[PDB]
Design a protein around this ligand. Sequence first.
Ligand SMILES: Cc1cc2nc3c(=O)[nH]c(=O)nc-3n(C[C@H](O)[C@H](O)[C@H](O)COP(=O)(O)OP(=O)(O)OC[C@H]3O[C@@H](n4cnc5c(N)ncnc54)[C@H](O)[C@@H]3O)c2cc1C
Ligand SMILES: Cc1cc2nc3c(=O)[nH]c(=O)nc-3n(C[C@H](O)[C@H](O)[C@H](O)COP(=O)(O)OP(=O)(O)OC[C@H]3O[C@@H](n4cnc5c(N)ncnc54)[C@H](O)[C@@H]3O)c2cc1C
Ligand SMILES: Nc1ccc(Nc2ccc3c(N)nsc3c2)cc1
Ligand SMILES: Nc1ccc(Nc2ccc3c(N)nsc3c2)cc1
Ligand SMILES: [Cl-]
Ligand SMILES: [Cl-]
Ligand SMILES: [Cl-]
Ligand SMILES: [Cl-]
Ligand SMILES: [Mg+2]
Ligand SMILES: [Mg+2]
Ligand SMILES: [Mg+2]
Ligand SMILES: [Mg+2]
Lengths: 305, 305
Amino acid sequence: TVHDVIIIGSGPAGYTAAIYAARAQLKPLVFEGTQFGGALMTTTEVENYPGFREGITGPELMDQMREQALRFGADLRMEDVDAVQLEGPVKTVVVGDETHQARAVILAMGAAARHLGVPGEEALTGMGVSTCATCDGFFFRDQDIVVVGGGDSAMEEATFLTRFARSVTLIHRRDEFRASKIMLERARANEKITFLTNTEITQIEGDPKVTGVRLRDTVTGEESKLDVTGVFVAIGHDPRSELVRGQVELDDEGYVKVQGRTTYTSLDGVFAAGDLVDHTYRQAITAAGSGCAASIDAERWLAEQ
Amino acid sequence: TVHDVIIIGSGPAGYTAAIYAARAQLKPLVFEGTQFGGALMTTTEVENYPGFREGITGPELMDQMREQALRFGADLRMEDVDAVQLEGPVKTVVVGDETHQARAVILAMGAAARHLGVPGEEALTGMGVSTCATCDGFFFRDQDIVVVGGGDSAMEEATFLTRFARSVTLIHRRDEFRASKIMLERARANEKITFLTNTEITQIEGDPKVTGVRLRDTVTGEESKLDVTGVFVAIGHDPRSELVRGQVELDDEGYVKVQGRTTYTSLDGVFAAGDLVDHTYRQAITAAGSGCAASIDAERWLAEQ
Ligand SMILES: Cc1cc2nc3c(=O)[nH]c(=O)nc-3n(C[C@H](O)[C@H](O)[C@H](O)COP(=O)(O)OP(=O)(O)OC[C@H]3O[C@@H](n4cnc5c(N)ncnc54)[C@H](O)[C@@H]3O)c2cc1C
Ligand SMILES: Cc1cc2nc3c(=O)[nH]c(=O)nc-3n(C[C@H](O)[C@H](O)[C@H](O)COP(=O)(O)OP(=O)(O)OC[C@H]3O[C@@H](n4cnc5c(N)ncnc54)[C@H](O)[C@@H]3O)c2cc1C
Ligand SMILES: Nc1ccc(Nc2ccc3c(N)nsc3c2)cc1
Ligand SMILES: Nc1ccc(Nc2ccc3c(N)nsc3c2)cc1
Ligand SMILES: [Cl-]
Ligand SMILES: [Cl-]
Ligand SMILES: [Cl-]
Ligand SMILES: [Cl-]
Ligand SMILES: [Mg+2]
Ligand SMILES: [Mg+2]
Ligand SMILES: [Mg+2]
Ligand SMILES: [Mg+2]
């Protein structure tokens, strides 16, 4: 049984691809993962996804998307793809001890935001701990917050956040910065930003919400506590391209490369969408847009065979 | 008074750009047009926009988007931009006898679908007359329908529609086809497609919904009537780039060109999104995704000044 298309991933890119493929009568087979629903399934509020004048929670939005895909006939499986064979006319995905095949595959595995890995980070996620200044900076008006990281991401998040926050403490575990000189220099010039180098967070305090961070000097071991009400983690992303490394061309940071303004990868019959590809915007609406494009690409490519 | 950003257009690209720019505290000034709300403001059902398990009407979706932009502080004006000056640090838009200025401009004027221009076309829009096989082909299962046009668009729409329709009559006013040989040959091979060359539609019949089309031979003048329940107009699109021709680089069909996978045009401080740029996907979700990207591009570009 060779399916027309298999989709790997269940964030906005994967579900939008599933909606379009199903409505196109391709009977898409979608492997959602056991941690299904993408990055929004673990935020509280989504206010910048167009179409919801008063907002919607991340889980509510993903459940709409999932039920929408189901309504048009997508075959959804809450299982992880463990391995793929993507070269040639018939592609194979392996799911535990089960195999499935398809003429086209849409890769929508997303990117993992790096975690601090400290107590309180999970408990206080959406309650003061954020990954997304664009999304959440709004909510920290006149507040004292931290940003963690040493690259252009952290510099961009920190300087952006000063238009809301009373103060931004930028914390980095080294005394050297991997961020570009321009981004570094913009952060230095901003009077609302204080730099804390050679510093790591060991714990995030907060009873319902973030009240502070515990700090350790990575050189001397000196520990202290900072009172803050927000923690923005900006230590980088890891695109989830492990399944396809060695089969589909990746850039030096592991993002799947695509041709021009399409979703076509280096492999015939293989398309890629969402934050697996995009290291620039990383929003739900852009991932959904690219998931649509992947399905239209796949449909048109299938019609050429 | 020089604004940070002006947005021209009020479809999904323009409203999503407005939402992001407003949430970024850029106080975007948005000229919606008198025919505001984009292409969806004149369809009935939008079923493939992810986030609505049971669908939503086009006007309901656009009103959500508009109120969402308002909620975050967008300044919305239901007026047409009549002329622009986009070169240099301060850009000007002219609206009747009023002028407005901004450091960045986001172009989101969309593309106009060409119309047959015959009686019944407007009355029966969304009631049998469609512009979008992806969107509406679903609803014509086992029905006899027409597709109008002579290019790759019409060939693609007609062959796609045969997976739903009982029959597809492809009508073209010439006996020569501007579509590529592959697209032409695929349509010829499909047993559900009948070709009617040298034929124009003079009227679309239908009491609540499409019941037939009146036809004229463009050579002999012979007229007849075809019983059909759907009419898909696929005679091409005109991107709304007239305002910016001679200022921003356009491709040979008039679409605004953008740099790589960004929204940057050939002019510093000018960004473009939606169907003004995209001649491939032309969906609401993709236009919304690109409107987000234009605002993020614009925000980051503004921060560099
Ligand atoms: C805390 C947080 C809050 C956010 N808030 C917002 C917001 O308010 N607005 C906004 O626009 N964006 C927000 N974002 C960003 C947005 O969620 C992402 O940009 C978007 O979800 C990317 O979608 P994607 O489909 O490419 O990947 P993801 O959302 O990462 O989805 C990929 C999914 O596929 C699954 N998958 C991966 N590999 C496999 C495999 N091998 N087999 C099976 N399944 C697999 C994953 O487990 C995951 O469930 C937020 C992100 C985070 C982390
Ligand atoms: C009948 C119909 C049904 C459709 N159904 C679907 C569907 O179900 N699903 C789907 O995904 N897509 C659908 N589409 C396509 C979708 O609507 C478009 O792809 C999308 O709206 C493009 O958005 P855009 O913002 O780029 O431009 P548009 O939607 O064209 O919006 C541009 C807006 O800006 C305004 N504007 C233009 N020039 C100026 C100016 N100089 N000054 C001020 N304002 C100006 C225009 O009047 C218009 O209101 C449909 C299209 C049509 C025509
Ligand atoms: N995958 C991955 C790679 C690198 C990191 N860096 C990191 C981790 C924890 C902390 C911390 N508590 N303060 S600064 C910091 C930085 C995290 C995850
Ligand atoms: N802008 C623009 C340019 C070209 C067209 N072509 C056209 C118009 C009407 C009809 C018809 N009634 N049957 S075939 C056809 C084709 C329409 C609009
Ligand atoms: Cl390789
Ligand atoms: Cl290998
Ligand atoms: Cl020019
Ligand atoms: Cl000129
Ligand atoms: Mg995983
Ligand atoms: Mg996830
Ligand atoms: Mg107009
Ligand atoms: Mg319109």
